[PDB]
């Protein structure tokens, strides 16, 4: 169906080391395809998917020089924000950046992202109109004024609606067998007695791709979150994902509960009941 | 306020020799660039740099190397100079807004097969026409510099020991009369009253940028080093 | 694949008339163009930008409108002045999928010429007193619209016209100089058209 490309940047100031730490990763949907680590030996952009390996020497030189410029920029950004908030050099701080684009199932641009966090908190973000900036505080207003003067939004729009989408489609084709597949969840239910009057029903979803899935519990055909435990979707490590949902039910009432599995690779939504 | 400086401003080199062009900038700019300009046209990127101790290839990197020893300094290196490398070389610098690039003054470099053809100008001062003085009440003096190779010259006019700019019109570009001979001319127009005054001293000075002291020169002929050559005339009734 | 095309060579224009210097481009992604200017014996500096919103302006007297449909970014000005005589670079900024670089065109040389209101064409002969039989011809005070001839003969040299300004009240002088290596050379027939 719909697809996305995302780049994730993490810069952490290291008070006990000679340099800050910078990590950059590229994702297409849920598959990571590139990485850069400022502490690694190579000092180059590195392949992390089989399908990116068909790109030539110019691509890797290009991505290397670009990510290194990102690295230097985000290194300076740490010092800039330290000054903005009047913080000392003794503490460790984190700058995070994400940008990328979404396409529909027709592979045409839907949404574009460009956003920052400082110490886990929203700093500045590009709005969906792709012309505007959400600046959280007075420090981010200083960043906003720099960018409006350089017409950053207009240049970003050119990337997110042009280069981002074009390269996404290129990757989607080169990794057709991996990125355009849809794996239906293998499902089962487990039962555990927690006490003499209570029992745990766990609804499993295994070996599915992509990561997007909805597991819901119902009691008498009626949505039940009031006692539902839901773990974060986790990677199996082989390119497929896993998730489970559990409810604590009264003993003898197991069959009153149903688990509902919603996934793309599933022709019809599955209903599961304990038997 | 953002300023870029280059060194040297002029260089005459031999084919197969080593040329180092230097650039200096204290704008606190991370990005630096080398461009070449050919016969008053084009601006092609040779090498660039976004950080100290790293350099990237431009559009035309062949025969050139580059070094960025610090944020402030950016060297262009020609290991084995060729005739094709004769050009004007501009250094530039920018911050992250890399479409606003700030250029240095430029470096005129001429590469030659051998240094024997390098020759200083002969400067001549042609005195005003009496027909012009009588009919228009004006006097045009003409300075003519000839017989010089290459064309790394600057012409100035000097009246009563002071440099003048008003009433002056110098050729924008030197004229190639022969393959190894250039010519440059300029006009100084004063009033008839000014030319007729015997007190007034007129002088045209041509600064010729030739070889440096490091350049080897055989005995017999005088070395064509950087030198000033003038011609002068005084007011007459 | 990503390039700039400018008006070829020299554009000569009379003071007071509108400037029109052409720039077209080929761009893979949404274009961003810039005009750079270099005056004689000076560094190239930024003049104007293609940025907004809808097409229009930047810099001083000079303006340029981006027409993405036909890929145009022509440099315009209402009334040319003599100080506008410079070299003009149109530039394409590539920074979408590749590292930020400006791609410059070949540049178009602009020559703004004065409107000589009262022309007084005259050819003069000048002598070098330090040399025996060394002479020189000076064509001066002519109109900006006439053509100065170029060399047809070896040994004889003619310069292009230059403009001289006497800050003496209104004194723009067009001028061309000619000299030779021949036995006896007239001054009247050398500045003869074609």
């Amino acid at each position: 169906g719909s697809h996305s490309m995302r780049y994730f940047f993490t810069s952490v100031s290291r008070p006990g080391r000679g340099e800050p730490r910078f990590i950059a990763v590229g994702y297409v949907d849920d598959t990571q395809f590139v990485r850069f680590d400022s502490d690694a030996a190579s000092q180059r952009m590195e392949p992390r998917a089989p399908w990116i390996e068909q790109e030539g020497p110019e691509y890797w030189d290009g991505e290397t020089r670009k990510v290194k410029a990102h690295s230097q920029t985000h290194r300076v950004d740490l010092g800039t924000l330290r000054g903005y908030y009047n913080q000392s050099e003794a503490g460790s701080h984190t700058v995070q950046r994400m940008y990328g684009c979404d396409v529909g199932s027709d592979w045409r641009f839907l949404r574009g992202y460009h956003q920052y966090a400082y110490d886990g908190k929203d700093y500045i973000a590009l709005k969906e109109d792709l012309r505007s900036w959400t600046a959280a505080d007075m420090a981010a207003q200083t960043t906003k004024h720099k960018w409006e003067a350089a017409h950053v939004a207009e240049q970003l729009r050119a990337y997110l609606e042009g280069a981002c989408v074009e390269w996404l489609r290129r990757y989607l084709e080169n990794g057709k067998e991996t990125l355009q597949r849809t794996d239906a969840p293998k499902t089962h239910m487990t039962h555990h007695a927690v006490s003499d009057h209570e029992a745990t029903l766990r609804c499993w979803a295994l070996s599915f791709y992509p990561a997007e899935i909805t597991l819901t519990w119902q009691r008498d055909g009626e949505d039940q979150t009031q006692d539902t435990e839901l773990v974060e979707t986790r990677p199996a490590g082989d390119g497929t994902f896993q998730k489970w949902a559990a409810v604590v039910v009264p003993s003898g009432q197991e069959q009153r509960y149903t688990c509902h599995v919603q996934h793309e690779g599933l022709p019809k939504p599955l209903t599961l009941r304990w038997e | 306020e953002a300023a870029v400086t280059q060194s040297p401003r002029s260089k005459v080199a031999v084919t197969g020799g080593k040329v180092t062009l230097s650039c200096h900038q204290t704008n606190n700019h991370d990005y630096m660039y080398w461009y070449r300009q050919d016969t008053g046209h084009g601006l092609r990127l040779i090498h660039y740099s976004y950080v100290a101790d790293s350099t990237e290839k431009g559009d035309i990197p062949d025969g050139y190397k580059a070094s960025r020893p610090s944020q402030e300094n950016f060297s262009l290196i020609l290991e084995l100079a060729s005739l094709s490398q004769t050009a004007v070389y501009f250094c530039a610098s920018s911050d992250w807004v890399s479409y606003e690039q700030y250029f240095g003054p430029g470096t005129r470099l001429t590469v030659l097969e051998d240094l024997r053809n390098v020759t200083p100008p002969k400067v001549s001062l042609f005195e005003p026409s009496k027909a012009e003085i009588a009919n228009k009440q004006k006097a045009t003096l003409v300075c003519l510099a000839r017989g010089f190779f290459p064309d790394h010259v600057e012409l100035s006019w000097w009246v009563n020991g002071k440099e003048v700019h008003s009433g002056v019109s110098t050729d924008p570009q030197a004229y190639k009369e022969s393959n190894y001979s250039y010519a440059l001319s300029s006009r100084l127009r004063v009033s008839a009253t000014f030319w007729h005054n015997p007190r007034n001293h007129f002088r045209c000075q041509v600064q010729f940028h030739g070889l440096s002291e490091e350049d080897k020169w055989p005995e017999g002929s005088p070395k064509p080093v950087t030198q000033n050559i003038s011609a002068e005339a005084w007011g007459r009734a | 694949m990503d390039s700039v095309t400018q008006t070829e060579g020299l554009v000569t224009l009379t003071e007071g008339l509108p400037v029109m210097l052409n720039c077209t481009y080929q761009s893979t992604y949404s274009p961003f163009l810039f005009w750079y200017v270099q005056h004689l014996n000076e560094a190239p500096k930024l003049l104007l930008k293609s940025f907004t919103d809808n097409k229009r302006p930047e810099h001083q007297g000079f303006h340029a409108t981006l027409h993405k449909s036909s890929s145009s970014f022509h440099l315009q000005k209402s009334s040319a002045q003599l100080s506008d005589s410079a070299l003009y670079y149109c530039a394409l900024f590539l920074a979408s999928s590749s590292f930020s670089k400006l791609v410059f065109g070949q540049g178009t040389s602009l020559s703004v010429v004065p409107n000589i209101q009262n022309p007084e064409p005259a050819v003069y002969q000048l002598k070098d007193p330090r040399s025996q039989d060394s002479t020189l011809c000076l064509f001066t005070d002519f109109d900006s619209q006439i053509n100065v001839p170029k060399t047809m003969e070896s040994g004889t040299f003619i310069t292009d016209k230059t403009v001289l300004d006497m800050k003496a009240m209104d004194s723009k002088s067009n001028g061309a100089i000619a000299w030779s290596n021949q036995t006896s050379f007239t001054c009247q027939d050398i500045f003869k058209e074609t």
């Binding site: 800039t80 924000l81 700093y123 720099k146 970003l156 280069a163 390269w167 | - | 999928s97 590749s98």
Partner: peptide
């Protein structure tokens, strides 16, 4: 492919 323009905070 990464963006080729590098804005600062």
């Amino acid at each position: 492919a990464l963006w080729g323009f590098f804005p600062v905070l």
